[PDB]
Amino acid sequence: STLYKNAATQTERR
Amino acid sequence: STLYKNAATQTERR
């Protein structure tokens, strides 16, 4: 779809 | 609204 999409995030150790 | 509501979450130290 052009109206929405999926997204993934992941925090990283710093 | 009866169709949706807001919700809050907070992790706790254990």
Added chain:
Amino acid sequence: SDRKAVIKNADMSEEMQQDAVDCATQALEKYNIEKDIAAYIKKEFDKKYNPTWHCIVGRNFGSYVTHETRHFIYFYLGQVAILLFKSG
């Protein structure tokens, strides 16, 4: 599984809550990275309970979200917290 399920806040039928716990158990057995666990759960819930679900998995986070009535759960499974809700 030896993980303890503790449902902290739910607006959801009992059967759907149980399905969230069962789905998260399968995700945790397959995947070690939080984003991969979250994607597994989100995709299963989109399939079984219609789009559009969103899933956050982690050990330190707070949230403020809006959810459709009867489609929200926040729970611990072992030491991991899982937020799963439907919106939009």
Added chain:
Amino acid sequence: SDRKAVIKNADMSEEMQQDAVDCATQALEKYNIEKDIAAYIKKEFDKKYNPTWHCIVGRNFGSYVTHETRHFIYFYLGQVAILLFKSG
């Protein structure tokens, strides 16, 4: 403020991205608890950029979400990660 803003993943206009950083800066100066920071940001974005936004603030989490085109940002401000997106 001495907090470093690092935008990790955005699908969002430059001005809206800057507004997310500015809003989060104000939230972090007022509040210490992640859920309160998240609520401040969510409410401001609902007001300025229409419902319905969802905000997660934390140091350890992964996610899989669905968002409306051009309404997604994931960024660090200092040591805190912030996920802010519009759906539904």
